[PDB]
Tab-separated table of C-alpha atoms and ligand atoms in Angstrom:
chain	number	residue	atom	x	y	z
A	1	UNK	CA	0.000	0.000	0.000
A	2	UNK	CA	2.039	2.603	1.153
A	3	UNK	CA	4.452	4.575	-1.236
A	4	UNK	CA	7.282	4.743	1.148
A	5	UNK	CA	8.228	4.669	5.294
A	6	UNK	CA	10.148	7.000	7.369
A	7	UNK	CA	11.073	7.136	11.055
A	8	UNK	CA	8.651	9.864	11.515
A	9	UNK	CA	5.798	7.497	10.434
A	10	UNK	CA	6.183	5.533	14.432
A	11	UNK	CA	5.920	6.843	17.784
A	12	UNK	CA	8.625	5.283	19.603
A	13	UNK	CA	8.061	3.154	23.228
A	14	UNK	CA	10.464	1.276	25.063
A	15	UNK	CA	13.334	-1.209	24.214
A	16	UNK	CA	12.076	-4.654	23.297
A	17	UNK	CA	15.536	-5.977	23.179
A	18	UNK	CA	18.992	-5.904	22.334
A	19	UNK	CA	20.508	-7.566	19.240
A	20	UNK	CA	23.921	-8.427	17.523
A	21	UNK	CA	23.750	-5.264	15.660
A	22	UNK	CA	21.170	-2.390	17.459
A	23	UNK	CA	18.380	-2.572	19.460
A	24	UNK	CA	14.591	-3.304	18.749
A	25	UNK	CA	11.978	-1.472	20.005
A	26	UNK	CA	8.466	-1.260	20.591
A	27	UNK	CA	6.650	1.103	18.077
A	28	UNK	CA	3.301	2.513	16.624
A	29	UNK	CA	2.350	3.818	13.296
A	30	UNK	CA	0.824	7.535	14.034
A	31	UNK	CA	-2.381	7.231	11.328
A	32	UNK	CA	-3.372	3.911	12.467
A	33	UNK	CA	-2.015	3.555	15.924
A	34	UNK	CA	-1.354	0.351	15.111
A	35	UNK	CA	1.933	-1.357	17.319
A	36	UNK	CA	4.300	-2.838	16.246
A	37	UNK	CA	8.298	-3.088	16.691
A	38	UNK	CA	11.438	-1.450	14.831
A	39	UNK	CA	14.539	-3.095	14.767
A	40	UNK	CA	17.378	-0.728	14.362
A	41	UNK	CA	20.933	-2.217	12.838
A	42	UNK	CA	23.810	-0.079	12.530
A	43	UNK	CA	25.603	-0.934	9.441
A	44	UNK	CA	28.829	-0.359	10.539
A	45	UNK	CA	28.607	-3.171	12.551
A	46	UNK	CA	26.908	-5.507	9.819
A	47	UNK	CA	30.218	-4.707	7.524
A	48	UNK	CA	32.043	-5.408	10.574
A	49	UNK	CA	30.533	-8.557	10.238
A	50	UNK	CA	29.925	-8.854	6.988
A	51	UNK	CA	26.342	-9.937	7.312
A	52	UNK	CA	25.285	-7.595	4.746
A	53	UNK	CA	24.854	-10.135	2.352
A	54	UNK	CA	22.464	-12.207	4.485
A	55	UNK	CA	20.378	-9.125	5.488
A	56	UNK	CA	19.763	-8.433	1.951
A	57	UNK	CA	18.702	-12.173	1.279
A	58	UNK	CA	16.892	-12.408	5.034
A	59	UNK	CA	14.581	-9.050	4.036
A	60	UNK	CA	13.851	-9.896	0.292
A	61	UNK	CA	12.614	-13.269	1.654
A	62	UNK	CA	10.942	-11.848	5.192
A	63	UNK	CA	9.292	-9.652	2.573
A	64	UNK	CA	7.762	-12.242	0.444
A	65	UNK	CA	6.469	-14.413	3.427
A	66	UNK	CA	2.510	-14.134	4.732
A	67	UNK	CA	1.681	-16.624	7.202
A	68	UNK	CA	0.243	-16.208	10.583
A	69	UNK	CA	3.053	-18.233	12.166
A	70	UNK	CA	5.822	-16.384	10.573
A	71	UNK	CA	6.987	-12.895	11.752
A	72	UNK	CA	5.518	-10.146	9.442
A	73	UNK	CA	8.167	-7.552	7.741
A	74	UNK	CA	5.532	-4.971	7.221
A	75	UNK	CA	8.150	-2.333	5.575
A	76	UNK	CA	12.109	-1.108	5.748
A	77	UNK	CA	14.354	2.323	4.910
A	78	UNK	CA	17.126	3.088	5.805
A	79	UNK	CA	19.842	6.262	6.564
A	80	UNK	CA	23.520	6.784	6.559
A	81	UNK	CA	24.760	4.691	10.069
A	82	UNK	CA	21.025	2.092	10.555
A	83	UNK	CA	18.793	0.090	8.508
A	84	UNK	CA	15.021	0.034	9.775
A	85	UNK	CA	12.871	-3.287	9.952
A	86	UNK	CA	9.346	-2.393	10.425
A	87	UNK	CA	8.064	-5.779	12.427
A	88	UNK	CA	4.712	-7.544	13.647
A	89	UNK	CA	5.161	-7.104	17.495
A	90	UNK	CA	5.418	-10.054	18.954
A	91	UNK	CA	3.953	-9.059	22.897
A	92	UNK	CA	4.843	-12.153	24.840
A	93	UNK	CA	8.296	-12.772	24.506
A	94	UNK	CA	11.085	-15.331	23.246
A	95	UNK	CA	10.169	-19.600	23.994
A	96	UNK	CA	13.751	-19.514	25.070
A	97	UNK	CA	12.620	-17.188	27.917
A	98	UNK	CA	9.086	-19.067	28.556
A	99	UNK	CA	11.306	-22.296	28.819
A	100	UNK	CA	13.674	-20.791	30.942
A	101	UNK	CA	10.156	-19.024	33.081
A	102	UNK	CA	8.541	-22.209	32.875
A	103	UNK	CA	11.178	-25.446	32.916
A	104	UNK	CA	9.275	-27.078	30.531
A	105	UNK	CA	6.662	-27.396	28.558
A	106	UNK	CA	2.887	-29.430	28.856
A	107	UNK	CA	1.901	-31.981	26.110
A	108	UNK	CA	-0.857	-29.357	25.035
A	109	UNK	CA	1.752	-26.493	24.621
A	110	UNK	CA	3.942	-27.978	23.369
A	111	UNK	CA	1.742	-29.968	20.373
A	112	UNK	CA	0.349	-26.449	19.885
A	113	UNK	CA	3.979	-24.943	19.179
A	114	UNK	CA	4.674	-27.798	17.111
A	115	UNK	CA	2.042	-27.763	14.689
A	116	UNK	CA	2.490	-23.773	14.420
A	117	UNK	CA	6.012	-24.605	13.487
A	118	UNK	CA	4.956	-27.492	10.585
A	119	UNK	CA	2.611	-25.296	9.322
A	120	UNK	CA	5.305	-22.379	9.149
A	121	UNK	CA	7.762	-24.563	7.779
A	122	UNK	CA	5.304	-26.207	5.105
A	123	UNK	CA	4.366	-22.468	3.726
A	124	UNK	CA	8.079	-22.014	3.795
A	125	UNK	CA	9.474	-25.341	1.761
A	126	UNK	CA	6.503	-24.662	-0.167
A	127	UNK	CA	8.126	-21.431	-1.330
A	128	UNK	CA	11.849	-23.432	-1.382
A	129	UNK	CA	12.565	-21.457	1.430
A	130	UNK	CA	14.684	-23.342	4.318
A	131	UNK	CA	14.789	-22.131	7.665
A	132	UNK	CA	17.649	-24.600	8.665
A	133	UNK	CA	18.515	-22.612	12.377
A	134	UNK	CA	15.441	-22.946	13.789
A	135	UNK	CA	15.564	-23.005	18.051
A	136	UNK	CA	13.855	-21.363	21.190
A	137	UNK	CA	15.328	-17.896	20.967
A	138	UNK	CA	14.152	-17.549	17.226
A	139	UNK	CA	10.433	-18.166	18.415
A	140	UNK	CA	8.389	-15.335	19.439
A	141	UNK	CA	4.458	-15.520	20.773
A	142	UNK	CA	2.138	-13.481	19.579
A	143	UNK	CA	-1.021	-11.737	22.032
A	144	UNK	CA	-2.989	-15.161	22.104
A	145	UNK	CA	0.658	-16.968	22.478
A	146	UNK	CA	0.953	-18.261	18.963
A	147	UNK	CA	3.912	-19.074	17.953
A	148	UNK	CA	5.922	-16.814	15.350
A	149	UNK	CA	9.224	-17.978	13.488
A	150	UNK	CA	11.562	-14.656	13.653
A	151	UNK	CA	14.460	-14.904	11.665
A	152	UNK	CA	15.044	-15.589	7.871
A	153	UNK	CA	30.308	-21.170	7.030
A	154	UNK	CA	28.413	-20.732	10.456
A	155	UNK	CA	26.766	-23.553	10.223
A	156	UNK	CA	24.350	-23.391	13.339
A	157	UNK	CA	24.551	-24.152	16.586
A	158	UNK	CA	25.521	-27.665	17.286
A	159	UNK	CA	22.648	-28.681	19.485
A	160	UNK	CA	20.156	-28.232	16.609
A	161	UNK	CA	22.049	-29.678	13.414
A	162	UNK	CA	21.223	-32.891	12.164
A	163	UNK	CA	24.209	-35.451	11.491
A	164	UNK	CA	24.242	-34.514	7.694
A	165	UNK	CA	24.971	-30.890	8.186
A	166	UNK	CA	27.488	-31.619	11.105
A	167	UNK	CA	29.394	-34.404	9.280
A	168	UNK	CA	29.839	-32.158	6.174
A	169	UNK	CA	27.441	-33.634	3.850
A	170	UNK	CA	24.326	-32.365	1.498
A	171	UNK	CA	21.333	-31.003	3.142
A	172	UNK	CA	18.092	-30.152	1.772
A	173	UNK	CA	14.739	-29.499	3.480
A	174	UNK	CA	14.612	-32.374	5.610
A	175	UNK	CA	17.013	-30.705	8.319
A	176	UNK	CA	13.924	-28.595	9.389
A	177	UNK	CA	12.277	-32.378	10.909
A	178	UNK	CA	15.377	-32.841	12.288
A	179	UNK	CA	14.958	-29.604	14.149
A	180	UNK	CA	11.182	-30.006	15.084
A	181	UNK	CA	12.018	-33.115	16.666
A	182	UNK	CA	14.907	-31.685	18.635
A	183	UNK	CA	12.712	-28.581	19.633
A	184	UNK	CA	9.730	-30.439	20.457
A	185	UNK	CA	12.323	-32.796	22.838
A	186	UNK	CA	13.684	-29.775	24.468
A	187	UNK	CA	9.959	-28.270	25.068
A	188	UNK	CA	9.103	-31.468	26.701
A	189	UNK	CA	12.267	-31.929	28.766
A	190	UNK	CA	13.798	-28.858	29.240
A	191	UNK	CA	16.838	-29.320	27.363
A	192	UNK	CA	17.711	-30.855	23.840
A	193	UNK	CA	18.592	-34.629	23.389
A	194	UNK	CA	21.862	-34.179	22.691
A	195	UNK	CA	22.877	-32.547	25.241
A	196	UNK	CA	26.565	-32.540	26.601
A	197	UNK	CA	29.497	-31.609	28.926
A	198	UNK	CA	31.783	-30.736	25.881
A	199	UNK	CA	30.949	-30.085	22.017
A	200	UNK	CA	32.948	-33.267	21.140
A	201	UNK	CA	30.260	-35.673	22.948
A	202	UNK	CA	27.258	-33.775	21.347
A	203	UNK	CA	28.559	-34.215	18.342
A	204	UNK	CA	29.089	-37.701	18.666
A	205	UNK	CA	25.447	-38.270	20.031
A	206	UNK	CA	24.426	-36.602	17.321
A	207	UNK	CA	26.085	-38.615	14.183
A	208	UNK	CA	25.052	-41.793	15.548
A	209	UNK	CA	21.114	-40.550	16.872
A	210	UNK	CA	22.084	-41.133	20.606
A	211	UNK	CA	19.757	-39.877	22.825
A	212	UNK	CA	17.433	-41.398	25.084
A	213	UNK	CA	13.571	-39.542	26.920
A	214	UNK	CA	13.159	-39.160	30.802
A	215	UNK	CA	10.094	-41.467	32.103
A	216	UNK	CA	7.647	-38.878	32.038
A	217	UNK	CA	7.666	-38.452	28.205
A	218	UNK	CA	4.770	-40.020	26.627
A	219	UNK	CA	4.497	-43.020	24.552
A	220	UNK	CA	3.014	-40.604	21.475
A	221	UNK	CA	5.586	-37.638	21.933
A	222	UNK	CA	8.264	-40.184	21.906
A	223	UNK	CA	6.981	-41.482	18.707
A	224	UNK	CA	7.061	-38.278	17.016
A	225	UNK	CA	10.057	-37.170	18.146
A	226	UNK	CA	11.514	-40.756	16.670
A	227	UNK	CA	10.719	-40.480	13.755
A	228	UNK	CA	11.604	-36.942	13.037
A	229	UNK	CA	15.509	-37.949	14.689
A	230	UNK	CA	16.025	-40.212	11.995
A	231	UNK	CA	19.601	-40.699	10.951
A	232	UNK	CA	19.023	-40.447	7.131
A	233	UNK	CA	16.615	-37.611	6.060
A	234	UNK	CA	14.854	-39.525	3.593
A	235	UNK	CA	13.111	-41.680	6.661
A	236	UNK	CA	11.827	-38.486	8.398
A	237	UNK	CA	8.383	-37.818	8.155
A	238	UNK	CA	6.796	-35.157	5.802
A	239	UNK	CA	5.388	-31.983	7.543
A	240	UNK	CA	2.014	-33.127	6.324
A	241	UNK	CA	1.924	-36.440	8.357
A	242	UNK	CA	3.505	-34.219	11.678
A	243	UNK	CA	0.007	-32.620	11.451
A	244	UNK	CA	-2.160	-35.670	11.680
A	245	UNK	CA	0.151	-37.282	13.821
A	246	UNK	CA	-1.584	-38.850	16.665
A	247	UNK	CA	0.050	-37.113	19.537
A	248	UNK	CA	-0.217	-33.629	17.934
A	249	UNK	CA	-4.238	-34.317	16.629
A	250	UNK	CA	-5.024	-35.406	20.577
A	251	UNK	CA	-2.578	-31.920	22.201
A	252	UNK	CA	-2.659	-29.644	19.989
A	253	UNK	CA	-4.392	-26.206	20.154
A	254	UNK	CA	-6.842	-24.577	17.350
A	255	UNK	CA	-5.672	-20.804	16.432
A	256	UNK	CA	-7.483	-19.176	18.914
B	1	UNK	CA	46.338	-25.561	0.559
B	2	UNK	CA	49.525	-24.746	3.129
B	3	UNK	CA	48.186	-25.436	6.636
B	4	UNK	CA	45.257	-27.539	5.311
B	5	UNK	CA	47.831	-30.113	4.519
B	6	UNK	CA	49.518	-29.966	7.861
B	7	UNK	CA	46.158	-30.617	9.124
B	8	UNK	CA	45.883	-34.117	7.404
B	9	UNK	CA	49.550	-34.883	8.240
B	10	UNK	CA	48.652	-34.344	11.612
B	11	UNK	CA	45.223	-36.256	11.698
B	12	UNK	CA	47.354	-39.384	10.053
B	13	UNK	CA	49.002	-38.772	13.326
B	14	UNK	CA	46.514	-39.356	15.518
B	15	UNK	CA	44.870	-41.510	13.616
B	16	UNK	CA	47.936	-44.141	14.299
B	17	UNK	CA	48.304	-43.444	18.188
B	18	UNK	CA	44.886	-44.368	18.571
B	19	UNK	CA	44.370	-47.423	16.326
B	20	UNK	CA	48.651	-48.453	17.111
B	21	UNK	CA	49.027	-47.759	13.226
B	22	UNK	CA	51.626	-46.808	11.093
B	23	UNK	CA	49.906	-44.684	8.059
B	24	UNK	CA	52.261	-42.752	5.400
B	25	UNK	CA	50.645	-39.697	4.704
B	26	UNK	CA	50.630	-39.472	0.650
B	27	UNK	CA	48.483	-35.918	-0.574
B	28	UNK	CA	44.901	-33.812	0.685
B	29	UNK	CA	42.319	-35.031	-1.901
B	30	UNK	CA	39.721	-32.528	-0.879
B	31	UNK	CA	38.985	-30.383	2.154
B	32	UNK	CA	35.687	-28.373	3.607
B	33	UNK	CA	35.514	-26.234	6.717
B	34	UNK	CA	32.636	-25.129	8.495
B	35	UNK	CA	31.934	-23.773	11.970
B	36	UNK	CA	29.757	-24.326	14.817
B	37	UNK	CA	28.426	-22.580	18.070
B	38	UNK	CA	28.336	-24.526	21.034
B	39	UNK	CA	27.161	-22.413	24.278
B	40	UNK	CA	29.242	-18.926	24.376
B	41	UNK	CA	32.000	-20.474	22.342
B	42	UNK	CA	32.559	-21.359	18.295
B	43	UNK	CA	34.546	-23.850	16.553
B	44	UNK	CA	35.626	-24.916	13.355
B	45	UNK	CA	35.863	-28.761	12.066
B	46	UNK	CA	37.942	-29.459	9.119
B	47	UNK	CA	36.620	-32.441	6.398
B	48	UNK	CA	39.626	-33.609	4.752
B	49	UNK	CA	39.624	-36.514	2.189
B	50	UNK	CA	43.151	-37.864	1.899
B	51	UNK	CA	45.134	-40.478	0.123
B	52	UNK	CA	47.597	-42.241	2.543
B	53	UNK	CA	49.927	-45.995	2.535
B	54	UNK	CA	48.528	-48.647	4.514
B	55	UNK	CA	51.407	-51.343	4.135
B	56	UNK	CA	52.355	-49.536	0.862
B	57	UNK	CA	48.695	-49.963	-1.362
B	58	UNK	CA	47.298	-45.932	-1.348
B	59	UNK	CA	43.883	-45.315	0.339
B	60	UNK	CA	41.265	-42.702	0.490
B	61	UNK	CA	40.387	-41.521	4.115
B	62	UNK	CA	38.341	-38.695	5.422
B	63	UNK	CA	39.515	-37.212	8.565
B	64	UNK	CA	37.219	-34.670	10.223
B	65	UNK	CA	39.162	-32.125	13.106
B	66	UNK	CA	38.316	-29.711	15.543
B	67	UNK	CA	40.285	-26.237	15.116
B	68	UNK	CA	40.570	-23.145	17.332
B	69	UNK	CA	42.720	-21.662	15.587
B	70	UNK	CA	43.100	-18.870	18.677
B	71	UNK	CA	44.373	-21.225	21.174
B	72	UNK	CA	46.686	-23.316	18.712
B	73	UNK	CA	44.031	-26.167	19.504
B	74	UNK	CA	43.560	-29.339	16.790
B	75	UNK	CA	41.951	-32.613	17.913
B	76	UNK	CA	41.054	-35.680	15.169
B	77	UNK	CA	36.881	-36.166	16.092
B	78	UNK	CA	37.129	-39.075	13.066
B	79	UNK	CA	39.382	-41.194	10.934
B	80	UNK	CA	37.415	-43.281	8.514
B	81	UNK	CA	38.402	-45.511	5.261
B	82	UNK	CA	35.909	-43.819	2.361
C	301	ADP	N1	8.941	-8.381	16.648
C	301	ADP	C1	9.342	-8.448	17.916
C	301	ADP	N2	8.430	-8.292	18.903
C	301	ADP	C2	8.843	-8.339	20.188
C	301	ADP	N3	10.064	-8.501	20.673
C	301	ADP	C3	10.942	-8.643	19.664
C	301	ADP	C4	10.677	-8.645	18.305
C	301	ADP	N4	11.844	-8.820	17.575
C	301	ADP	C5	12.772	-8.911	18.497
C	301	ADP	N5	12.287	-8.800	19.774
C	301	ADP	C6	13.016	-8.913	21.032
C	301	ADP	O1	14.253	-8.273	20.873
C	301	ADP	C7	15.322	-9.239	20.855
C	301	ADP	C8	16.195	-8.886	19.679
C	301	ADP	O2	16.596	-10.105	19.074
C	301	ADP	P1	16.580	-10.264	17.502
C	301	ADP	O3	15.569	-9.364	16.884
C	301	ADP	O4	16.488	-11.723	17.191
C	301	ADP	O5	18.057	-9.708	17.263
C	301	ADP	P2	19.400	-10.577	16.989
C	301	ADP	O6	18.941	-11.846	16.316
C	301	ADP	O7	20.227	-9.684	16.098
C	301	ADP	O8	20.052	-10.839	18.330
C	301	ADP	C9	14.638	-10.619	20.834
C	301	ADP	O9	15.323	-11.566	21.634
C	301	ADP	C10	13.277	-10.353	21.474
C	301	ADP	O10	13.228	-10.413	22.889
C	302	AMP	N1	22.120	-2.202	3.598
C	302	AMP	C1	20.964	-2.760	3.254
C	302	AMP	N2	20.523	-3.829	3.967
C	302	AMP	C2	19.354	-4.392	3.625
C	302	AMP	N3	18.517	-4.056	2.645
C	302	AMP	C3	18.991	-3.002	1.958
C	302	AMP	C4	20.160	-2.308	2.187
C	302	AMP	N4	20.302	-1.287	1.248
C	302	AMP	C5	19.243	-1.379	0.485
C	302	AMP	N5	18.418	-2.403	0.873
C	302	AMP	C6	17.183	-2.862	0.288
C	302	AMP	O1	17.156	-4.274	0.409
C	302	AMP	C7	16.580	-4.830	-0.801
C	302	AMP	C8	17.651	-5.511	-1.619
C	302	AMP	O2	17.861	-4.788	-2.873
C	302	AMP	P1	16.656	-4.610	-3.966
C	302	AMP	O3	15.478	-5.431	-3.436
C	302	AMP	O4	17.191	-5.121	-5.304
C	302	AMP	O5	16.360	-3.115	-4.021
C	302	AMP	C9	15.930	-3.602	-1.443
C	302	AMP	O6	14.696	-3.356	-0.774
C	302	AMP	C10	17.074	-2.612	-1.206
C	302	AMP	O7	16.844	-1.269	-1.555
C	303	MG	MG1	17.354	-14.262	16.968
């Protein structure tokens, strides 16, 4: 719709948070009053980094993305010394700071983030987009605590790569059902499966699908989380049959 | 291709303390990098396919290493025939 944004389009509110490269705050556009949240990057620190090139990619695709599971990018601009992100506010917060509130997660939460995150991840592969780093500080809730997915030769972080991006090999979509299953582990337990004192045992646990479920995890969340930890990607499930899995048809949530 | 190839000599290295073997280190066929975070820290693995003597008939192995290259740190994760 609109032509064009400027800063002067948002009354500013407090800080939401600090990032790598500036800070993100709360924010409302004056004509609708609408909120929402600005994330302010100083480029001299993204050349620092060289990140550039990934912000460029990250925005074209944010832009292109609609789903209500997925962050909205609404709008950016730009001066000499920050780029401007014009973002859906996401009111309740970071999982990783629920998780860290909370412990872990119920069955019915936890289903309920879970089939948020298929869903977001089907409309995704569906547009050959690949998430690929998905984990609980990259999860915002929106105001009825839906889940949203945030961001779009560091690889990762160990804990959430599957054994063909951690032993060097070709990846493809299928890394993303590694993920959900190691996410929907962590939400359950508290921590991911594979789990370790140093980085040379998780990555050991990890190439040969080592990990085991404390006693209170259920007979149906162990089966999903099984299958999507499968060694080779091709035996992972699809996204579709995550959805009418068993455990997440009896736990799950319906958008409110 | 300078301290790549170091890299393999020394993963032949390891590789025969470990296993009590005596490999001859021969040339670096191919070799990948990539990094990971782990907590507050990063590292980077090296994937190095080599050619190397086992009682004088060449082989192809693929060694995979841990690097910090800040704290002059290398340790073999794998050794594997291809
Ligand atoms: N749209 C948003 N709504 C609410 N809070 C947000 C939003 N985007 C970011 N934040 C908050 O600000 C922090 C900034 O993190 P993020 O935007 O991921 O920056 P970076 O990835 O560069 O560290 C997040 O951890 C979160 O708490
Ligand atoms: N430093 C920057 N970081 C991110 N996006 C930028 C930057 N500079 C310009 N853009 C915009 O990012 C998109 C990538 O280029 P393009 O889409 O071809 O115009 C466009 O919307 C650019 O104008
Ligand atoms: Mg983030």
């Amino acid at each position: 719709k609109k032509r064009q944004w400027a800063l002067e389009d948002f009354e500013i509110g407090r800080p939401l948070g600090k990032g790598k490269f500036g800070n993100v705050y709360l924010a409302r556009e004056k004509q609708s009053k609408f909120i929402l949240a600005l994330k302010v990057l100083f480029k001299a620190q993204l050349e620092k980094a060289g990140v550039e090139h990934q912000l460029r990619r990250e925005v074209e695709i944010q832009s292109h993305l609609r789903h209500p599971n997925i962050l909205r990018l609404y709008g950016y601009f730009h001066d000499a010394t920050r780029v401007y992100l014009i973002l859906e506010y996401a009111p309740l917060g970071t999982v990783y700071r629920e998780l860290q509130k909370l412990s872990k997660f119920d069955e019915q939460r936890t289903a309920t983030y879970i089939t948020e995150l298929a869903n977001a991840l089907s409309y995704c592969h569906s547009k050959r987009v690949i998430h690929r780093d998905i984990k609980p500080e990259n999860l915002l809730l929106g105001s009825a605590g839906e889940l949203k997915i945030a961001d779009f030769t560091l690889a990762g972080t160990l804990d959430y790569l599957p054994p063909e991006m951690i032993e060097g090999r070709m990846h493809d979509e299928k890394v993303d059902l590694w993920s959900l299953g190691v996410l929907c582990y962590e939400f359950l337990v508290g921590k991911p499966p594979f789990e370790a004192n140093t980085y040379q045992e998780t990555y050991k646990r990890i190439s040969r699908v080592e990990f085991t479920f404390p006693d209170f995890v259920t007979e149906g969340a162990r089966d999903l989380i099984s299958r999507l930890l499968k060694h080779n990607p091709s035996q992972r499930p699809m996204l579709r049959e995550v959805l009418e899995h068993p455990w997440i048809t009896a736990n799950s949530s319906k958008p409110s | 291709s300078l301290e790549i190839e170091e890299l393999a000599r020394f993963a032949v290295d390891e590789h025969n303390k470990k296993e009590n073997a005596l490999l001859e280190f021969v040339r670096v066929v191919k070799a990948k990098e990539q990094m990971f975070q782990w907590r507050v820290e990063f590292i980077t693995m090296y994937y190095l396919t080599l050619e190397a003597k086992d009682g004088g008939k060449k082989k192809l192995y693929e060694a995979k290493v841990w690097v910090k290259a800040a704290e002059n740190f290398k340790e073999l994760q794998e050794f594997k025939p291809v």
